[PDB]
Design a binder for this molecule. Sequence first.
Ligand SMILES: [Mn+2]
Ligand SMILES: [Mn+2]
Ligand SMILES: [Mn+2]
Ligand SMILES: [Mn+2]
Lengths: 266, 272
Amino acid sequence: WQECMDYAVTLARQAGEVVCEAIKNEMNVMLKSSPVDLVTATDQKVEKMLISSIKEKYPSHSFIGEESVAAGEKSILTDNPTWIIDPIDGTTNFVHRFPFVAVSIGFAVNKKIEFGVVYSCVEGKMYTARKGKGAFCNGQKLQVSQQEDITKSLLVTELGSSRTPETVRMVLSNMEKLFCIPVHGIRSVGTAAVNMCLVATGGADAYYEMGIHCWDVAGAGIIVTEAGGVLMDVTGGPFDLMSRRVIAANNRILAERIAKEIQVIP
Amino acid sequence: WQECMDYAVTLARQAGEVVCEAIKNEMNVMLKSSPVDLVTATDQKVEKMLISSIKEKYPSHSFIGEESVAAGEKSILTDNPTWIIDPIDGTTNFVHRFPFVAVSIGFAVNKKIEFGVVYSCVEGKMYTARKGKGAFCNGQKLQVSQQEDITKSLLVTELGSSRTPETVRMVLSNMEKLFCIPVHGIRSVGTAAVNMCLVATGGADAYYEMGIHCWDVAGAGIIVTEAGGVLMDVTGGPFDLMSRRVIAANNRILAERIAKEIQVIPLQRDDE
Ligand SMILES: [Mn+2]
Ligand SMILES: [Mn+2]
Ligand SMILES: [Mn+2]
Ligand SMILES: [Mn+2]
């Protein structure tokens, strides 16, 4: 499986080079499901540019991609080598030239993630990881922090794209509870994938979010666990790919504490 | 003023070298106000250095400094050449190695800010700005976004260090109001100096916050405005440096809108 990996990292460093060429241009922003749910050409162009080259070398494999699922291809996962893509995680960052934008690839076989690649291109930081072989950014091994005390932890989370009043009120409600535990802080850089990568590094101790997707967590998740962290559902139950709710923490002590605190948005 | 300023930039960079050296290893983390209000030896070390360096060649000047004020000194700004110093902006980021800690320096003469130097050592970025000569990150000139539609806005703010309940309530409230305009989003990187530098580059359209001190915005503020941005009080009034309140927007139109939506949080000023 060590070839699919190196291939993936080349794709990503390439895709990323497009995204970051694009960033500095004027763009047409298109919407999707709401006036805050955005996409641009590059999101689409890059994703097609990804799915082509992979299947043009790996044609047996299935693909789950974010924007392809949008234009009508289907979000179902089998045991077949599936490449799981998010061409630009951080589209609003992208649209705004806010410097956190990531190309995320995840290769799950038998519905289990085998490796992940997350390239943050404004930064020049290539995160990669390989089940049972370690996590790295730019050729430097990562390891999560040690803090087992919630009251001394720095959490990362996102506010969401839902402006559904009830969905918003639980988002902030949960932030309030955790904030008041208290914890040292809550931070957001604009992308589920780079957030999870900051946790893999030890710069933060846990990340939590309800309402994410396959492709959001499919590259960075295995980078967290291989830096020594744990992935969990917001409910204190197990994390599967299709769950839509995650907690990527440094350890189970912290994961379980966050879970105890926050009410699930359905 | 250039003399004083070109000295500042070099001091920022020495301070920066120290902070990003210290961040790699073992730390003494102590409390100021609370369980959450932290400070390290490096914070205090750096302020004393920065001040011992300036008072040397320009002893005629004053200094407001975060940790100086904490050891009993007073944050009354006058017309004297004052240096306004935050030795590490982002001390919690620092404690965690979450990679945004700025060294901020602001120079006031007759109570108007002349120049500012924010250096974010991890990033390798040196934002500067002299009044009238524009703002630069690392040489390259900066310019704020041209956006004037609140509903297409990316905003940055902080949750504050207060866990005083009625305050935290008000904080998340003012957030909800803006989120539900809607705006495209809201980010927090962890330091008011950097959050504002980002507004200055146009990566974000507007930062706001109640609960800051003069040393958080003294240096970053002139970078924003010199980038073409605006500063304002949360009341729509002109920015007061001592008020503990700030909107740094890309333009009056955005700044006035955030101003309209958010409730004013009761805080004691820096001059009381
Ligand atoms: Mn995306
Ligand atoms: Mn995404
Ligand atoms: Mn400070
Ligand atoms: Mn500060």
